[PDB]
């Protein structure tokens, strides 16, 4: 019944189907075979050295399998005809697919490429262009080949006795068509064949996702022990909601899903808002509307105050635009596919969306609301051709008295001026001429002629870039030349650091400007449920009416000059207190228009993908005889080149459209005057543009309809506004006039905010893709498991799947099934390093690198199939660990000796016990600067060489610096060659480090002297005693598996800040701020320098020791006081090694905080500050395992008896982890510390 | 040159921790190769007195 016994039979059966002649034993750590293909056999034929048997050996091992080398069997990969056992179905979706195909008739500039038919022996001017696009657009790179994904569902559908539709349309693709593509399993980036259609990998990636989405639901529906979902009155089947959706996209899935995701997201926002009894989850927090310290009460219901408000004309107009958006996506697919049926289950819900209720306390309404958010992720990573279009500023709106353009431009001048003043109070100033060159390392140049040169030329220019996104179409990224970005670095620096803090008060009548705007970081620091608690409590409040407008194509109306001049007017007038000092000869007012000049951002030439027209061939050669030029600009491989646009537009249209065309030089590609995403002021400026617009929003509402709609909060983030207001009348006519004056303010600014995008609702909040509904948490999961952003190279396979399980902690936290999230990792633990070995071996002997023989030079590489239960063997024993009973608990080596002593885990961890100390090891790979360096570095580099070299060869730790500059020089050649060149070196290392591997007995629970881990708690016993309250805590995030619902029930959501971040990580906060310190060195780096010397003779010998790290000099103050603090304050000198409590579900719980100790911990008082953390980090995993089993909630107490022999073993083992014997003569630390002097008298 | 016993300063000069002074700093320091040459200048002037 356990996941380790039932699930391991399935992943073994996948290997029993994939490599069909493999005898697999579970109790072996990893079995080894090999296989080869003749793509490399043909190559050394061409160099002269012919081979003995060309394909005779291939005949020997196809189906007889009778040959095996060195005793190691040789087994072939399965063909495509057999991955579904030759099954066939009716599959009405598949016959919709095959009539929705079209050859040689597509528009060559288009966003998401349609169904092109592959006909063999066709032309090399169209079909090579279509093969050029699909090689860039349709790529399924990642960590797992897509072939074994299709075999995995074939094995998984049999056990659940349920057939997914993604396999039904795939099983008809195997009997009529042989092989869709040839993905090489070594690199996963090459797809060199399409047999019937160019969009065949998109056909599978939307099918290998379609199958998991209904295995996720059907497993979850039995966990809630309900038959089907329940819209507010009627029964509804969730799989029919997806099968009605999968048929509609299947003509053109990247285009259909991008226009159908808008009514699906809008439906979940406005569901339970119009019903008269409304059930909320009563919350309580601070007086500010943005306070995050929230306390939850039980569920209750209340009468709706806004019942008659939804009879208005704002919602009735907004609903028919969304019912149109359903119908336009339908009519585009009713003709391109043969189907006459569409969406019959969803259309019955949108006709009455407001008045139907939604109750979160029943699970049959929370799964359905989560499912519709997770519908849209089948066609992940929309990769799209973009075209190069210009400014076209005749459409740019000129400032007028009748328009608000000049009033917007004078508002935003007073906001950059105000951000500079309020950064002066937080000690954020401009950079100085002294540290101008030192402060240039914040990015990864400066010449008086290179700074005066322009870029509005065909000869020299700027070059665009592009990077992908999860569901959206591919957004651009701007690459600016580094000569003219440093003038933007010097003047936008006290704005990047100022809005970097997380705290803020958002009141409109407050005078300050920093709290009301906020720019987050790359990763969400903390959880998502934890730091979005201000969104939850305002959907649970009867008197908050939130307004959140949306700007469609924000840059096209940021293109206007009104925010360009008004920003630069406020830059110049605020540099007036800095008007005397000169930057390298010239003033500061001259250099701001070197980063915001005319040939910098006003009018610059940009080169993207080119314009191109589809024409005939006979008229092409009659004109191309005069203009055959190249060399100025390049042309894609399908297209035929000409010189200019003016000879390319005269022959433009053709009924046959045989051959393509492209202008190389005479194009005049693109000129843009718009705030770039690449500048240092991207997220600072456009969020201030929402502030200048949003302040004009409150004025016209207050001047046309006064007394109504008072404003209480103002949150401005990237391309979003969020007003927390309250409405003072439930009127049908008056509210219709207030909602009209909001759109008239945006339209008279220049933008066009859609009435279907604008949100004016009482009981629903969306903010930065976090949906809050009626006091609870409705989650989406757009993160996916098949595709990826770029091709991923598995360099640290110990640390890759340890990082991949973090993105599987989040998935089950949004409602994915817990055990289905175990089966995915147990599949994904065997198929990672299978093709990372160079040459073949013979077992129980040496490992052959060179062969020089015709037999073994055919069997090139090996296969390494690890056991599926390598997920559960803990770290430090050459395999990564996650616990089977709960995914959020880190399996460590002290947890392995505990989890076998518990009676409720003798059945689950019975097959785990036989594979420990059985697994193979892990593929664990590991001039200008004379100006841009601190004077700690320049004095150390301009030294006499007789003094500079003694810090390099004999002595010195020196983890950052000139050799790290060489590592920074190794980081810039890293991307192609240095990753590949050392990959030839680690493989010769890994064969020796595998042949010298002996599976060693006598596991140890301990660490070195100068560090300690969570395994320190095994010195003492632990007695589960006491009794606590069995009160079920209340929490907003419903929709969890029972392995996660019971951890949040017994242990509530946290209410304070966690204390377990030790003072070793308090100085990491000092090293987190500096980006010249953040990406390079940290606490494990800086404590090794304290390991080289403690207890010096003067503090003036103390401040200077980290200038010898040659990074900074200011933060040696924080290392002056804290070492003086640890000379005053007690400390255990050791560090803390851990890998636990970092995933975003553990940060939400009330574990590892100061209020967690006071009820769940009882420890002896003779323990230091970093020893009580090692007990508490042990104590967190014990209680989370105590709750996820069903064991009774007790108070964990570590006990020290009076057994005078056992009191001696503790005083012997606490001593050696505090002070080292031999290393005292290395550090020359004094033993007269107060903490280490107590150890004589602690336990006695 | 013969140093004294290292316990003759440990029981009486650095005997009380949580206090430092002029003497308690000088005990934790070893002479360089040139300060040890100036000790040789002290002991030459004590043998040839005036």
């Amino acid at each position: 019944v356990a996941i380790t016994v039932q699930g391991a039979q399935l992943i073994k059966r996948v290997v029993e189907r994939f490599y069909p002649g493999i005898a697999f034993n579970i109790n072996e750590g990893a079995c080894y075979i090999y296989k080869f293909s003749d793509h490399i056999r043909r190559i050394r034929m061409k160099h002269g050295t012919k081979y003995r048997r060309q394909a005779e050996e291939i005949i020997r091992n196809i189906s007889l399998r009778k040959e095996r080398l060195y005793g190691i069997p040789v087994l072939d990969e399965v063909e495509w005809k057999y991955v579904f056992d030759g099954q066939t179905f009716q599959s009405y979706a598949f016959e919709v697919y095959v009539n929705s195909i079209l050859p040689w008739s597509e528009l060559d500039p288009e966003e998401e490429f349609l169904r092109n038919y592959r006909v063999s022996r066709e032309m090399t001017e169209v079909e090579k262009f279509i093969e050029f696009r699909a090689k860039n657009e349709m790529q399924i790179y990642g960590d797992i080949p897509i072939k074994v994904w299709c075999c995995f569902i074939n094995e998984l559908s049999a056990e659940l006795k349920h057939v997914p539709l993604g396999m039904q349309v795939m099983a008809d693709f195997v009997n009529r068509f042989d092989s869709p593509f040839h993905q090489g399993n070594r690199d996963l980036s090459n797809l060199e064949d399409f047999q019937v259609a160019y969009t065949t990998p998109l056909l599978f990636e939307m099918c290998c996702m379609e199958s998991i989405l209904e295995f996720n639901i059907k497993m979850r529906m039995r966990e809630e022990e309900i038959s089907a979902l329940e819209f507010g009155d009627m029964k509804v089947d969730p799989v029919g909601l997806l099968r009605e959706f999968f048929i509609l996209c299947l003509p053109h899935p990247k285009k259909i899903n991008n226009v159908l995701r808008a009514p699906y997201s809008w439906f979940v926002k406005m569901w339970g808002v119009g019903a008269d009894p409304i059930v909320v989850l009563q919350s309580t927090a601070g007086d500010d509307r943005n306070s995050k310290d929230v306390f939850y009460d039980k569920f209750r219901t209340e009468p709706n105050r806004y019942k008659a408000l939804f009879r208005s004309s704002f919602y009735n107009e907004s609903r028919r635009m969304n019912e149109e958006k359903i119908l336009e996506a339908v009519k585009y697919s009713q003709k391109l596919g043969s189907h006459d049926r569409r969406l019959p289950l969803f259309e019955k819900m949108l006709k009455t969306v407001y008045t139907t209720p939604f109750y979160p306390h029943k699970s049959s309404n929370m799964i359905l609301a989560s499912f519709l958010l997770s519908i849209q992720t089948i066609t992940g990573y929309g990769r799209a051709w973009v075209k190069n279009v210009s400014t076209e500023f005749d459409k740019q709106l000129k400032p007028n008295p009748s328009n608000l353009v000049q009033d917007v431009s004078d508002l935003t001048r007073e906001f950059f001026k105000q951000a500079y003043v309020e950064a002066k109070e937080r000690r954020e100033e401009i950079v100085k001429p002294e540290d101008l060159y030192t402060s240039m390392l914040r990015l990864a140049v400066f010449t008086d002629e290179e700074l005066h040169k322009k870029y509005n030329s065909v000869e020299l220019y700027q070059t665009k870039g592009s990077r992908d996104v999860p569901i959206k179409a591919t957004r651009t990224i701007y690459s600016i030349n580094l000569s003219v970005l440093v003038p933007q670095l010097i003047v936008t620096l006290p704005l990047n650091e100022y809005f970097s803090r997380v705290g803020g008060i958002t009141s409109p009548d407050y005078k300050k400007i920093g709290g009301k705007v906020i720019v987050g970081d790359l990763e969400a620091t903390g959880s998502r449920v934890m730091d979005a608690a201000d969104c939850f409590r305002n959907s649970a409040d009867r008197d908050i009416f939130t307004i959140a407008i949306d700007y469609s194509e924000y840059d096209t109306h940021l293109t206007r000059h009104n925010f360009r001049t008004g920003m630069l007017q406020g830059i110049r007038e605020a540099m007036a207190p800095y008007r005397d000092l000169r930057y390298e000869g010239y003033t500061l007012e001259q250099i701001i228009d070197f980063g915001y000049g005319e040939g910098r951002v006003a009018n610059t030439l940009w080169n993207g993908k080119r314009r191109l027209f589809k024409t005939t061939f006979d008229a092409y050669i009659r004109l191309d005889e005069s203009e055959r030029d190249k060399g100025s600009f390049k042309v894609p491989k399908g297209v035929l080149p000409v010189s200019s646009v003016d000879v390319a537009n005269r022959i433009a249209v053709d009924k046959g459209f045989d051959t393509l065309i492209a202008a190389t030089d005479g194009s005049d590609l693109a000129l843009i005057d718009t705030h770039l995403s690449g500048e240092n002021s991207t997220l600072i400026a456009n969020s201030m543009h929402n502030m200048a617009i949003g302040t004009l929003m409150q004025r016209e509402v207050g001047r046309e309809q006064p007394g109504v709609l008072t404003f209480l909060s103002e949150q401005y983030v990237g391309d979003d506004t969020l007003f927390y207001t309250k409405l003072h009348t439930t009127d049908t006519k008056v509210f219709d006039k207030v909602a009209a004056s909001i759109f008239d303010t945006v339209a008279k600014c220049g933008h066009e905010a859609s009435p279907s995008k604008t949100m004016m609702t009482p009981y629903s909040v969306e903010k930065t893709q976090t949906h809050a509904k009626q006091g609870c948490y409705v989650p989406q999961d757009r993160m996916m498991i098949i595709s990826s952003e770029r091709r991923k190279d598995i360099e640290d396979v110990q640390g890759y799947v340890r990082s991949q399980v973090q993105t599987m902690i989040t998935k089950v936290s949004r409602g994915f099934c817990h055990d289905l999230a175990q089966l995915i990792l147990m599949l994904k633990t065997t198929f990672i390093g299978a093709w990372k070995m160079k040459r073949t071996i013979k077992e129980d002997a040496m490992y052959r690198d060179r062969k020089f023989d015709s037999n073994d030079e055919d069997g090139f590489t090996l296969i390494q199939i690890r056991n599926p239960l390598a997920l559960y063997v803990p770290i430090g024993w050459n395999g990564y660990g996650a616990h089977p009973a709960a995914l959020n608990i880190v399996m460590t080596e002290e947890m392995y000796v505990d989890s076998i002593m518990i009676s409720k885990l003798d059945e689950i961890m019975a097959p785990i016990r036989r594979i420990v100390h059985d697994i193979p090891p892990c593929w664990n790979e590991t001039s200008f600067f004379s100006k841009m360096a601190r004077p700690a570095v320049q004095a150390a580099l301009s030294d006499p060489q007789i003094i500079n070299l003694v810090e390099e060869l004999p002595l010195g730790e020196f983890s950052p610096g000139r050799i790290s500059r060489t590592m920074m020089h190794s980081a810039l050649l890293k991307e192609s060659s240095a990753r590949t060149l050392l990959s030839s070196g680690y493989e010769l290392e890994y064969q020796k480090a595998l042949n010298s591997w002996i599976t060693q007995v006598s596991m140890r629970l301990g660490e070195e002297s100068g560090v300690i881990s969570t395994s320190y708690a095994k010195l003492f016993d632990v007695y589960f005693e006491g009794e606590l309250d069995g009160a079920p805590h209340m929490f907003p995030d419903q929709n969890l598996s029972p392995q996660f619902y019971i951890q949040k029930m017994m242990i509530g959501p946290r209410v304070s800040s966690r204390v377990r971040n030790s003072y070793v990580d308090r100085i990491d906060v000092i090293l987190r701020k500096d980006v010249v310190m953040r990406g390079f060195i940290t606490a494990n780096t800086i404590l090794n320098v304290i390991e080289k010397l403690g207890t010096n003779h003067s503090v003036g010998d103390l401040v200077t020791v980290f200038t010898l790290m040659n990074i900074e000099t200011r933060v040696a103050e924080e290392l002056a006081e804290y070492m003086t603090s640890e000379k005053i304050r007690f400390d255990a000198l050791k560090l803390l090694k851990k890998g636990i409590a970092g995933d975003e579900f553990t940060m939400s719980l009330n574990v590892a905080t100061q209020d967690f100790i006071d009820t769940y911990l009882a420890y002896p008082y003779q323990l230091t500050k970093t020893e009580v953390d090692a007990i508490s980090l042990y104590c967190t995993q014990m209680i989370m395992l105590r709750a996820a089993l069903g064991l009774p909630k007790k108070k964990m107490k570590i006990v020290v008896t009076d057994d005078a022999k056992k009191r001696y073993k503790i005083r012997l083992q606490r001593f050696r982890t505090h002070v080292p014997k031999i290393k005292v003569l290395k550090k020359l630390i004094d033993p007269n510390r107060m903490t280490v002097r107590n150890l004589e008298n602690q336990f006695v | 040159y013969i140093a004294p016993n290292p316990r003759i300063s440990s029981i009486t000069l650095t005997q009380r921790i949580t206090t430092t002074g002029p003497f308690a700093i000088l005990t934790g320091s070893t002479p360089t190769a040139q300060q040890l040459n100036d000790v040789r200048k002290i002991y030459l002037a004590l043998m040839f007195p005036g």
């Binding site: 001696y1208 001593f1215 031999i1222 005292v1224 033993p1231 002097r1237 004589e1240 | -």
Partner: peptide, 23 residues
């Protein structure tokens, strides 16, 4: 060199004599 080590529990009072193996 030539240092020896044994099973000791006195953290301060025995490592005083450990430098006597050094000197």
């Amino acid at each position: 060199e030539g240092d020896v080590l044994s099973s000791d529990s006195g953290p301060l009072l025995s490592v005083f004599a450990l430098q006597e193996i050094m000197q």
